[PDB]
Structures are given as structure tokens and as C-alpha cells.
Design a protein around this ligand. Sequence first.
Ligand SMILES: O=C(O)CNC(=O)C(=O)O
Ligand SMILES: [Mn+2]
Lengths: 20, 429
Amino acid sequence: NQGKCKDGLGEYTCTSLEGF
Amino acid sequence: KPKLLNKFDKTIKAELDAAEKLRKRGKIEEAVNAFKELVRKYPQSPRARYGKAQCEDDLAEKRRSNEVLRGAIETYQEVASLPDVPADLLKLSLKRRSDRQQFLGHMRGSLLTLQRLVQLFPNDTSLKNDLGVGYLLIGDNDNAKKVYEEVLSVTPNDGFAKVHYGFILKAQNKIAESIPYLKEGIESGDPGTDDGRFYFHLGDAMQRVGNKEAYKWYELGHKRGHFASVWQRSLYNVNGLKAQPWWTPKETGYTELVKSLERNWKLIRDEGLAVMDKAKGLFLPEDENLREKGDWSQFTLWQQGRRNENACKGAPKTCTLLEKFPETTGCRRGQIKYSIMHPGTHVWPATGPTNCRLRMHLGLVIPKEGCKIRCANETKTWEEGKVLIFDDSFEHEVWQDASSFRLIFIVDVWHPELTPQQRRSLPAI
Ligand SMILES: O=C(O)CNC(=O)C(=O)O
Ligand SMILES: [Mn+2]
């Protein structure tokens, strides 16, 4: 999402996935 | 019943069924070999190639192997590269490709697959909706918004498009406009709309406009399992962690950290003030749309458990002091930062993303009146050289109505009940 959820929950997703 | 066999594949349906039988019986190794034999024998067969891919997929799940899954992602593309692929098979193969790319975190790759899907199937609204998600996952809100506008222009009652369009509007600070889309989308009951993100932001938007029905949606999001409670609305949680808005140092167990912060507070203060005075550009304005009004900026030393080396040049003794406490420097779901707030500031009620951190605030320059913070139902003030500790996954709200600036130091720690392996493995936020 090229922006991070620091103080809030404003991005569509807050993590980057790594599979298993 | 999908039509997965072209003309030629119908003539070898027996062989194809036998291999698929091995796969569904769970004999995945035999299935892989059987479909590999069918692919070498019938190199143009789309059903044989899809079987190979599905076998690799199943193997990847069995072995929990990302490497095997990358293999499967390539075979799903091979399927679509063959001649005379039935439409239902082409769609299944490329959809699963995109889904597994997203599962692995290959969001740009997933996006390209989804763009191809929408080209190949221009009348499939659901594929357009999935494309919009692709754009959202790479941070391309402008293109996502166009996709959902197209979807709504053809199917105006599509709930999935409604909630995602409302999410986008809300993220653009189009608060009033977002509310009908979020609300109608959740009420649609359509697949994909019963999602915590949309309850969270519908309630937040209503709170911002003064609409008192906000907590109705918080209660329903709680009842539907999206929120731990109506007060604690984080969406990236480890279930089971002790939940209370305010913590003491001993309750947290981080007594050495709190003591170090309080005993050395003037040094921490003075490094922050020096950065204010001669490197003010290190303080960046708050950029998550959290303010109603006012001026608020932060100077970040750590984020996602990574030291900002240039930043620490500005607060070198403070950074040295903190290196002794991995419970904060290694908190990959929190930050370490100075926070300056000026008069006339009001931060809207809001929730952090995760219940996995606790937030310490060390008072550094606190005007005697005008500054306060509410968490859940308890409201407190800061004091110079004293630490307050709250769980920002609970709704909290901040005011600054002094006549001069208010400087604090924010130190996130791992929730104390998280185990070492959890601290090592949880995805960073
Ligand atoms: O008041 C500040 O500077 C920061 N306050 C918060 O809302 C928080 O730390 O989450
Ligand atoms: Mn906050």
C-alpha cells in the first residue's frame, strides 16, 4: 500500500504478506 | 458445472480423470507424475496443464512451501498460454494465479494477472471488483477508484463495489460522501462486504460528522466478530492478549525501561528541543488524516523495529539509551518518536491498528493547562519526566488548547504477554 499504518488504520492493508 | 475440456481433452478424458482422481484422493506425488506424463504426451492439453498446476498447489500446501507455490503460479500461466483453452478454465487458472501471487505477497504480479483477466472477460463485474483490490493492494487508490466507478456505473447495487468505493472516499477525507457507500455496501450483505475495515471506517466517518449512529455499527462489528470489543477496534490482533486502556509500569513488567525514561528525561527532552531548533525538518507532519484541526508533527527514531540512522544522529544519546531495551527497539508493530502538538489541535477519536503494542508517553514539555488525552472512558494529563502507558488499540482522543507547544516522547513496546516467538514472527506494522 506504499504507506504504513503507524498511528491509525487508514490503509487497505497494514502488512506485507510472505506466504507460508 | 464448469466446462474445462476442449475438443481434444474430451478424447483423453479417461487419462485426465484418472490423474485428477489420484490428486483428489490425496495421492499428490502420484498425481504430479501422472499429470507430468499427460503434459509430455499431450503438450498442448490445457486440462493436463491445469492438473499439473493444481498438483503443485496442493503440494505447496502440504509442504507449506512458497517455492513449490511459485512453481504452481508459473504453471497456471502456462495453461493460459496454450491453444484452445475453454473460457471457464482460462478464468479459473488465471484467477488462482492471481490469488496465490497475493498470498505470497507478489502484489504487482497479481495486479498484472488481474488486468489481463479483465481484458479477457470484459463483462465480468466480479473480475473488475478483484482488479480494484489489486490496485488497492499496491497503493494505487486513483486507479482503484476508477475501477469501482465503472463497476457502479453498470451494476449500481453491487455491494462490494459500494464498500470499496466508500473506503476510498473515506481515505481521501470525503467523509460525508463515504458514509452512504460504506453503509449501503455493508447492508447489501454481498460477499466480501462483511469486513472489519468497513465497519471501522463507517463508524469513524460518522463520528467525524457528528452522526450518533456510529456506535451502532461498532456494536454490530463486534457482534460479527471483527472487533474484540466496541472500545477496542484494532484489526491486526493476537487474540487473548490482556485488554485494558491504561497500564501501570509494573503491570507491563517493563520497569527498567520506564525508570530509564524517567530518570534520563531531561536528556531526551534536550535532544528533541535541539532538533526543533536546528533541524526542524526532521519533524514530519502527521499524515494519517487523524486531525480535526491544529498542528502536530513527529520525529521518528525507530519504526517497524528498524533504527533510522540519520534520525538518531539528531538524538544520539537518546538512541544509545534505548538500545538497551529490545522490548521497544525490536517492537516491529510500534515506533519510537518525539511528538510535538501545538495549540488549537484536536485529534479525532481513533484506534491504532494492532492490539500487539502498548504505547508509553514520556512528558517532556507540558504546558500547565490545556493538554489532555482520553483513552476509552478515562482521561489523563501528561507530566514532565513521567511516563503514561495506554493501549492505543482502544479508542483515544487528544486535545491541545495551551498557549505554547507540548512535546512528548512516544515509546511503543510489545504487549507483555506476547511470547518471544510471536515477537520474532508477527508481520511488521
Ligand atoms: O498526542 C500525541 O502526540 C500522540 N497521541 C496519540 O494519539 C498516540 O500516541 O497514539
Ligand atoms: Mn493515537
